[PDB]
Amino acid sequence: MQEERKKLLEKLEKILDEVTDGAPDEARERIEKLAKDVKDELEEGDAKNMIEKFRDEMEQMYKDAPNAVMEQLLEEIEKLLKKAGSLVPRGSYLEHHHHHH
């Protein structure tokens, strides 16, 4: 917490705040579970991995239903994932389309 880590996760939880509220209606309750789990993982389990999980989960629901902010939020978590990639070169995107409902 002496190397901008709190500011990185503060902005990250600020994105998750806008993903739940600025969700495509029905997609919100899907987001609220995983976003709540990220908060635990910030100290409990693997926070950095949950930033990847939520980033790739967002693009699944974005391809399924894009409002306007949903797209911008993909770009936001991406900026934060680069800084969260501490010696870790990862972010190829897990290839999805819709997979059917």
XYZ file of N, CA and C in Angstrom:
303
model
N 0.842 -1.239 0.000
C 0.000 0.000 0.000
C 0.873 1.284 0.000
N 2.146 1.149 -0.435
C 3.122 2.272 -0.509
C 3.582 2.506 -1.979
N 2.801 1.977 -2.938
C 3.200 1.871 -4.366
C 1.975 2.037 -5.312
N 1.007 2.886 -4.885
C -0.202 3.275 -5.677
C -1.256 2.118 -5.808
N -1.040 0.985 -5.097
C -1.948 -0.200 -5.163
C -3.398 0.144 -4.746
N -3.562 0.931 -3.649
C -4.899 1.398 -3.200
C -5.588 2.287 -4.246
N -4.840 3.191 -4.901
C -5.400 4.078 -5.954
C -5.865 3.268 -7.191
N -5.094 2.223 -7.526
C -5.396 1.312 -8.647
C -6.726 0.542 -8.401
N -6.860 -0.038 -7.189
C -8.070 -0.794 -6.779
C -9.257 0.147 -6.445
N -8.958 1.398 -6.035
C -9.990 2.424 -5.721
C -10.747 2.805 -7.012
N -9.953 3.044 -8.075
C -10.453 3.301 -9.433
C -11.168 2.051 -10.002
N -10.640 0.848 -9.680
C -11.200 -0.445 -10.148
C -12.619 -0.683 -9.556
N -12.763 -0.522 -8.228
C -14.078 -0.600 -7.528
C -15.047 0.516 -8.005
N -14.478 1.678 -8.400
C -15.239 2.808 -8.997
C -15.823 2.379 -10.380
N -15.056 1.574 -11.153
C -15.548 1.005 -12.433
C -16.691 0.007 -12.157
N -16.450 -0.952 -11.237
C -17.454 -1.974 -10.804
C -18.762 -1.318 -10.274
N -18.616 -0.140 -9.644
C -19.742 0.716 -9.201
C -20.580 1.201 -10.418
N -19.879 1.581 -11.495
C -20.508 2.027 -12.760
C -20.995 0.847 -13.642
N -20.429 -0.365 -13.459
C -20.847 -1.562 -14.236
C -22.178 -2.134 -13.690
N -22.334 -2.145 -12.351
C -23.592 -2.579 -11.683
C -24.743 -1.581 -11.950
N -24.465 -0.283 -11.740
C -25.462 0.797 -11.912
C -25.758 1.064 -13.415
N -24.690 1.131 -14.235
C -24.802 1.360 -15.695
C -24.916 0.070 -16.528
N -25.317 -1.032 -15.876
C -25.604 -2.327 -16.528
C -26.809 -2.269 -17.511
N -26.819 -3.139 -18.575
C -28.019 -3.364 -19.427
C -29.166 -4.128 -18.687
N -29.844 -3.408 -17.757
C -31.045 -3.874 -17.010
C -30.867 -5.260 -16.302
N -31.143 -6.361 -17.034
C -31.149 -7.740 -16.477
C -29.720 -8.258 -16.167
N -28.720 -7.720 -16.896
C -27.300 -8.106 -16.739
C -26.713 -7.681 -15.367
N -27.388 -6.728 -14.682
C -26.930 -6.158 -13.392
C -26.681 -7.226 -12.289
N -27.669 -8.104 -12.030
C -27.586 -9.118 -10.932
C -26.439 -10.148 -11.164
N -26.160 -10.429 -12.449
C -24.984 -11.221 -12.900
C -23.652 -10.535 -12.483
N -23.606 -9.212 -12.678
C -22.439 -8.363 -12.348
C -22.237 -8.228 -10.813
N -23.349 -8.020 -10.072
C -23.327 -7.688 -8.621
C -22.669 -8.785 -7.756
N -22.872 -10.068 -8.122
C -22.205 -11.200 -7.434
C -20.673 -11.129 -7.596
N -20.204 -11.072 -8.859
C -18.756 -11.128 -9.185
C -18.006 -9.878 -8.659
N -18.652 -8.702 -8.772
C -18.119 -7.409 -8.268
C -17.971 -7.413 -6.722
N -18.957 -8.031 -6.038
C -18.919 -8.263 -4.573
C -17.749 -9.213 -4.200
N -17.578 -10.295 -4.995
C -16.503 -11.297 -4.789
C -15.097 -10.673 -4.960
N -14.948 -9.749 -5.946
C -13.674 -9.013 -6.184
C -13.235 -8.265 -4.900
N -14.208 -7.592 -4.240
C -13.986 -6.855 -2.963
C -13.338 -7.744 -1.873
N -13.835 -8.988 -1.730
C -13.236 -9.982 -0.812
C -11.794 -10.310 -1.241
N -11.658 -10.701 -2.516
C -10.392 -11.162 -3.121
C -9.259 -10.112 -3.074
N -9.623 -8.807 -2.945
C -8.642 -7.701 -2.746
C -7.627 -7.998 -1.601
N -8.042 -8.795 -0.591
C -7.153 -9.234 0.522
C -7.261 -10.768 0.774
N -8.488 -11.316 0.659
C -8.789 -12.763 0.863
C -8.037 -13.667 -0.153
N -8.480 -13.660 -1.424
C -7.883 -14.506 -2.469
C -7.102 -13.715 -3.523
N -7.311 -14.056 -4.810
C -6.525 -13.508 -5.946
C -7.238 -12.318 -6.643
N -6.978 -11.095 -6.143
C -7.564 -9.838 -6.678
C -7.189 -9.571 -8.152
N -5.882 -9.683 -8.467
C -5.342 -9.467 -9.835
C -6.044 -10.385 -10.864
N -6.241 -11.662 -10.482
C -6.944 -12.647 -11.322
C -8.434 -12.269 -11.499
N -9.053 -11.726 -10.435
C -10.469 -11.258 -10.451
C -10.683 -10.013 -11.339
N -9.640 -9.180 -11.488
C -9.651 -8.047 -12.446
C -9.727 -8.591 -13.896
N -8.937 -9.649 -14.176
C -9.007 -10.402 -15.455
C -10.400 -11.057 -15.643
N -10.894 -11.723 -14.577
C -12.181 -12.474 -14.601
C -13.351 -11.549 -14.959
N -13.386 -10.396 -14.282
C -14.454 -9.403 -14.421
C -14.359 -8.652 -15.780
N -13.121 -8.400 -16.242
C -12.837 -7.744 -17.550
C -13.347 -8.605 -18.735
N -13.017 -9.906 -18.698
C -13.429 -10.885 -19.731
C -14.937 -11.271 -19.611
N -15.475 -11.228 -18.372
C -16.926 -11.429 -18.101
C -17.759 -10.264 -18.681
N -17.267 -9.025 -18.466
C -17.897 -7.805 -19.005
C -18.062 -7.855 -20.534
N -17.025 -8.324 -21.266
C -17.083 -8.384 -22.748
C -18.092 -9.448 -23.250
N -18.292 -10.526 -22.466
C -19.351 -11.531 -22.745
C -20.757 -10.861 -22.736
N -21.035 -10.102 -21.657
C -22.321 -9.384 -21.462
C -22.442 -8.120 -22.364
N -21.286 -7.568 -22.779
C -21.194 -6.388 -23.680
C -21.554 -6.781 -25.133
N -20.967 -7.893 -25.599
C -21.313 -8.500 -26.908
C -22.806 -8.916 -26.953
N -23.327 -9.370 -25.798
C -24.726 -9.817 -25.662
C -25.716 -8.623 -25.623
N -25.305 -7.518 -24.975
C -26.131 -6.293 -24.835
C -25.235 -5.043 -24.565
N -24.878 -4.242 -25.621
C -24.127 -2.973 -25.460
C -25.044 -1.708 -25.403
N -25.090 -1.019 -24.242
C -25.860 0.249 -24.105
C -25.054 1.472 -24.649
N -23.910 1.790 -24.011
C -23.013 2.917 -24.387
C -21.808 2.958 -23.429
N -22.108 3.056 -22.120
C -21.084 3.040 -21.054
C -20.412 1.654 -20.917
N -21.162 0.572 -21.233
C -20.678 -0.840 -21.154
C -19.324 -1.024 -21.907
N -19.252 -0.419 -23.105
C -18.039 -0.382 -23.964
C -16.878 0.365 -23.278
N -17.185 1.573 -22.794
C -16.207 2.465 -22.140
C -15.604 1.809 -20.873
N -16.440 1.032 -20.160
C -16.045 0.278 -18.950
C -15.061 -0.877 -19.281
N -15.220 -1.512 -20.475
C -14.228 -2.499 -21.000
C -12.825 -1.850 -21.125
N -12.797 -0.632 -21.696
C -11.555 0.153 -21.877
C -10.947 0.583 -20.512
N -11.822 0.919 -19.542
C -11.412 1.366 -18.186
C -10.677 0.261 -17.393
N -11.317 -0.926 -17.263
C -10.711 -2.097 -16.563
C -9.390 -2.524 -17.255
N -9.334 -2.320 -18.587
C -8.165 -2.651 -19.432
C -6.915 -1.818 -19.035
N -7.118 -0.491 -18.874
C -6.068 0.461 -18.410
C -5.496 0.041 -17.035
N -6.414 -0.376 -16.155
C -6.103 -0.791 -14.777
C -5.456 -2.196 -14.733
N -5.824 -3.055 -15.705
C -5.300 -4.439 -15.828
C -3.812 -4.443 -16.253
N -3.429 -3.456 -17.082
C -2.021 -3.244 -17.494
C -1.116 -2.936 -16.278
N -1.589 -2.028 -15.410
C -0.883 -1.653 -14.157
C -0.961 -2.791 -13.097
N -2.076 -3.560 -13.127
C -2.291 -4.741 -12.244
C -1.465 -5.966 -12.706
N -0.999 -5.937 -13.969
C -0.120 -6.975 -14.520
C 1.338 -6.815 -14.070
N 1.557 -6.919 -12.742
C 2.885 -6.776 -12.105
C 3.813 -7.949 -12.501
N 4.670 -7.693 -13.522
C 5.547 -8.700 -14.183
C 4.742 -9.769 -14.975
N 3.418 -9.552 -15.137
C 2.505 -10.512 -15.809
C 1.999 -9.946 -17.170
N 2.574 -10.394 -18.333
C 2.060 -10.020 -19.670
C 0.836 -10.888 -20.095
N -0.383 -10.433 -19.731
C -1.649 -11.182 -19.995
C -2.837 -10.229 -20.286
N -3.650 -10.614 -21.289
C -4.837 -9.854 -21.700
C -5.212 -10.114 -23.161
N -5.209 -11.400 -23.554
C -5.486 -11.831 -24.950
C -7.002 -11.846 -25.282
N -7.850 -11.721 -24.230
C -9.331 -11.876 -24.298
C -9.745 -13.347 -24.564
N -10.529 -13.927 -23.629
C -11.152 -15.248 -23.814
C -12.248 -15.138 -24.900
N -11.975 -15.736 -26.074
C -12.793 -15.578 -27.298
C -14.267 -16.062 -27.119
N -15.193 -15.087 -27.006
C -16.655 -15.339 -26.898
C -17.417 -14.579 -28.008
N -18.701 -14.928 -28.194
C -19.630 -14.208 -29.101
C -20.955 -13.950 -28.341
N -21.717 -15.039 -28.099
C -22.965 -15.029 -27.282
C -23.117 -16.355 -26.491
N -22.563 -17.450 -27.070
C -22.631 -18.859 -26.566
C -24.091 -19.389 -26.380
N -25.090 -18.623 -26.902
C -26.545 -18.801 -26.635
C -26.906 -18.419 -25.165
N -28.152 -17.947 -24.944
C -28.664 -17.615 -23.591
C -28.940 -18.912 -22.766
